Symmetry: D2
């Protein structure tokens, strides 16, 4: 019966996986072209953008989408990374491989960089590109990206947001907020199979691709994928390199279900489920990793353990039918709950119940019983 | 009932697709680790290599596997590409993005570069790396890789072979032939879902990764994927970047079926089917694109059309229940047959039958009836 | 790659089987009710009947549908069975269990009972019920049911036709021809999973169910299933006994595909494929079991073997990737080809090719080569 | 994400459904014969019986298996039915169609017939057959079958038990308890797809089939299915009437999983889950339909509603992601929980949570919060 409440893949709807069972479909096939076109439109929809913004779906995942941003860069370009933890630091790790200049702002552990501190930095020095993380998966911290952008937009040429753990769950307004690259992956809050990175580009980013050279490699140069994406939307097949055909069939079904629910409702569901889970944790007397309550993400929650060993908690919860994620930040001793994608009020009950039973057996100080009760309470106020 | 006799994906066995229907599996899951370990061993098996050779399975496909070879290179390295057509030329297109020096040898259209000509060139200039294409998909031409390598091995540091349209269908002996990188994709003669590049590295290539810097980017630096692969074989999960989890489940099932059939039998099946198809084409009085009979690949055959329009043949054959591939070489007017993966003697009958009926309707001069008869004859001598 | 060219199940379309993958559907579920209603309408469509005719879908298959006809009978009722072989004789075997009087007409082996001979019998004696077989699966013989009925309609109270191997492949006009019960199964020319019998009742048969007692048992009394069928069409769930829920989901998808193709086209496809196969057999110099050419059914062909052992032919063809059916009539030494459901021109080529190769190996006198050629010829005249 | 906590089908494991995706399997196919043989052995295993007891798997379900017991009867035979409700009464409804004499014992509503009362009746009159219901699905009442049989065995010729809602969940010892027919269906505690009745016959029942005539019809005469079952176990195909081939593939996979878990563990799991659910109901202050605690079945629990309308509860719970079953007994106002098959401790938490939230909204007097707490408590004492 095992539940996957991990950081992605999470539990995938059966209808989504089943869409990948076509034994005679390839990259030129009519069924593929249609699924690709449909998914490109789905991307515009979940990110809040009109047809002026160009969607791309490329092989790999969040990390390949991130590296592909080098398609917009030239040697010696100046980049500012606003990093709240592991995945903010990945921008720096990627850019270390390229002839570019990188400055990184970091907050105290588990905190977030204030919009004021980013504003101050973009006024001090001239940046070609600013990189933000919408939800930092290592700590469960959501950056106030709208607030940051409103402040910095006029000082910088390009703004990119890693929405890998946010798109499909948190409010995203790529066009309204004037983001140049908003990216995500297939296996998180979109709730589909892994193997794709997804990007939405502003007209300004698109102009760079159409008119300038870049420092990109071959596979991850977005100029190489553009003909494939443009073609698909005009109902034509084009070939750059073979895409994950069947993973894209599954993505199109995920997007069908997302449009059926509606993005607003889907955001509200994530807010409810996450608040319900956080109520349960607090009632138990457990501390959340994220330092600032306004930054509690609706996809990931870090749970601090004062006594028990996170490793044993994880081994134990799998035994009781839920796979959670390990905590990977040197400043904290914790584990993570992934609550995203197709997550329901019932998943919130199971999560807090499995946490209660596992911690009681391992001798972590908690208020047994209080957790599920607090969850039920929040779910009732729906 | 439509047949996919394309260049990859081709028709995928139902058992293979079904293996991807596990809705609660992620990159740390025990089921994933096991499928990854199993597939890594399968790779050693289909490429003819002992445990001293290191397998890697990365996201994307043949093009990402090819680009990842930059992990073995330094600025100003000298590379020789032996190119028989489109996919040989892709090596040059990739290496144009990197600070390296590239020389390319090309034969007459539809021919292949003789081992003597490669020998001569590696004696004239000192090369860090030589790139070969086992089967050139654009023309259906198989390079005598063993013969080339026996001649050049002592003159060059590193030898890589693009086995994208050969591995799982043609004889491959990576260790015996002393190849440093043998690569392929998931969606060709392996007969699985698209989304993966596969590589097998010699101890010498492995030593470079373990001890030297390179010109690689981030996502395609093989050093970043090595911990994941090493870990999986020791039954441990490790994370670099999310792999196409469910595509890997499918690959492990493909490898289970391959081991059941046996690699030698599988090679024999491809040889039979391809010879049977070529007999049918010849009986019809159709010319094959590949110039030299010793190079007729057992995965792809280019079919020259003297009168009818290839585009119309393709539209027509889909109507009669087979999707073939377009011919993409400026020197020829043709279409391509993909005969690889799970292909059977019965697929050979259908292919030549659908070709007969389609060409008859479009007015291409052929000997009606003779095709299927010649196919049946070859199949009967099994 | 094995082909199932048997008498039912035959090869099932993937889309049909996949429709059965819903892990949370039961007999009251909205998805089930909808599939049941849809299939009941599909039944009216493939049998040529308006809304005045009542469809029923019951558990089991052709034999349970046949036995359920006892729902229309009283003790001492007089029945005439027109039997062309094994499945005509099944009517008598069923009715032997009931307090009824049965007379059977039979022709010479492999022949059919002429409409004149049935007319003569219904004039001599008064019958409550006449039972016909549309296609007799043991011999491949199609009875001219329209001609029989036109002659006998005025002399008899009730006419039932076993369309198990005819519905979905041969012309069926239940209302126009004034049939009282036309029945079939799910696993034949409808091309779906086994586990259901299907019946279409005239207003006169329906009046019997609504107003009279019968000799029926419990499970197979159609009066017990009527509330379930009527309910489903009015969008309501009702319970008699648990039906094969998921088999019914698959049937609804089969009917979706049938309506997409159109019944007329589907009949034409079966006629083409069967004629193509018969041309191949004749060109080979093989004799067909059915004695009279006007009775050659378009779903089944019996193939006489003069020398080889049918058992060995069957073992051999499975080896070459096609499962045919055994010949089970004491008067003949033969095997059977099932060509029904999703059968295509390509299946006809494979069938005759596999027959040629298998017979050549076993030393049955045939004209090698001529078979496939004659098939191709008929397919070309499409 | 909807849960099916109904009376059968319940939620089916994905592995089980997937086993039915084989598009080229029929009744003579080697894959079918193997699945049938395997399932017949599985039946002996879950019912506690050696090879002397004969398993049969027939089309339809529990009602067809029940009617097939007429295969053991002769005109004027005397039958005693011990009926605890709806499905006990079905025995009488079936036997009303046959030339037999039926006496029925019934207890007060929601109670059960004591072994003493059955003993008294079998001493007063001589009975050919006694029919028992192991779990009466309408009320959730388990009959102490072992105790009844120990008392009556010497006074009656044949004993049959309807184990439709018990086999795979409750202890069953058919051989040790000397039962002549123990029957069930595919879609209940076995957790597979609907479409099959399953029966296990004693040597004495088998002797009747082999040596005597009966009052059975045709399709449900077990003598007609015996050659099919005997054949399959000796690895040979035989044909009586087409079985639900793909449903049988699924059943064999269900039995594979059952053997993996072990029958004793599976019984313990059902006991735990059911006790946990009953604790939750009691903590809420809800009354259970079953009158006598020793008879609380571990597959079904009737829940009495004092204020709210059962119909609205059912409509509401579907909305909150669980489908339960309606209450169908004139003496009570209630709904039913099905907790059987693949049911887990986590399903118990969800069930009582969904019940709490739904009842709170409809104004049924309950102790909010107390339910889940009591469930968690029982699960923790595992
Ligand atoms: C915020 C964030 N950004 C980037 C990534 C990298 O994504 P991927 O593993 O798909 O390459 C992740 C990893 N889940 C992530 O959570
Ligand atoms: C010989 C050859 N090499 C490289 C490639 C590129 O592979 P991919 O499309 O999977 O990136 C192909 C494409 N079929 C190929 O056939
Ligand atoms: C003509 C005919 N009638 C009746 C039947 C009985 O159908 P079933 O096996 O589904 O009970 C068959 C068997 N395929 C048949 O071919
Ligand atoms: C105890 C009992 N016996 C008999 C039956 C009848 O079974 P079916 O609906 O499969 O015919 C049922 C129905 N669930 C049952 O629960």
């Amino acid at each position: 019966d095992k539940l996957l409440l991990h950081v992605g893949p999470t539990t995938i709807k059966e209808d989504v996986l089943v869409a990948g069972l076509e034994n005679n479909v390839g990259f030129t096939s009519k069924e593929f072209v249609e699924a690709l076109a449909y998914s490109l439109k789905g991307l515009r929809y979940v990110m809040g953008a009109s047809k002026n913004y160009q969607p791309l779906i490329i092989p790999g995942g969040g990390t390949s989408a991130m590296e592909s941003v080098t398609s917009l860069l030239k040697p010696n370009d100046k980049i500012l990374v606003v990093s709240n933890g592991v995945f903010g630091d990945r921008w720096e790790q990627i850019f270390k491989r390229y002839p570019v200049n990188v400055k990184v702002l970091r907050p105290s552990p588990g905190d977030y960089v204030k919009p004021g501190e980013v504003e101050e930095e973009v006024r001090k020095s001239e940046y070609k590109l600013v990189a933000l993380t919408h939800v930092e998966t290592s700590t469960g911290v959501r950056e106030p990206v709208k607030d940051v952008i409103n402040k910095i937009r006029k000082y910088v040429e390009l703004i990119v947001v890693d929405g890998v753990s946010s798109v499909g769950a948190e409010e995203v307004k790529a066009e309204e907020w004037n983001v140049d690259v908003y990216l995500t992956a297939s296996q998180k809050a979109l709730g589909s199979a892994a193997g794709l990175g997804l990007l939405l580009l502003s007209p300004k980013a698109l102009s760079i691709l159409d008119s300038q050279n870049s420092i990109a490699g071959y596979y991850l140069d977005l100029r190489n994928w553009l003909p494939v994406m443009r073609g698909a939307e005009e109902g034509k097949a084009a070939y750059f390199a073979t895409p994950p055909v069947h993973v894209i069939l599954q993505l199109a079904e995920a997007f069908r279900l997302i449009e059926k629910e509606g993005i607003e409702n889907r955001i509200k569901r994530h807010t409810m489920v996450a608040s319900a889970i956080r109520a349960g944790l607090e009632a138990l007397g457990l501390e959340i990793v994220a330092r600032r309550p306004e930054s509690y993400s609706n996809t990931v929650t870090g749970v601090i353990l004062k006594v028990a060993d996170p490793q044993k908690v994880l081994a134990g919860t799998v035994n009781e039918g839920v796979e959670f994620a390990p905590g990977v930040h040197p400043a904290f001793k914790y584990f993570r709950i992934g609550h995203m994608g197709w997550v329901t009020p019932n998943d919130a009950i199971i999560a807090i119940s499995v946490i209660e039973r596992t911690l009681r057996k391992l001798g972590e100080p908690i208020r047994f019983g209080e957790g599920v009760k607090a969850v039920e309470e929040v779910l009732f106020s729906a």
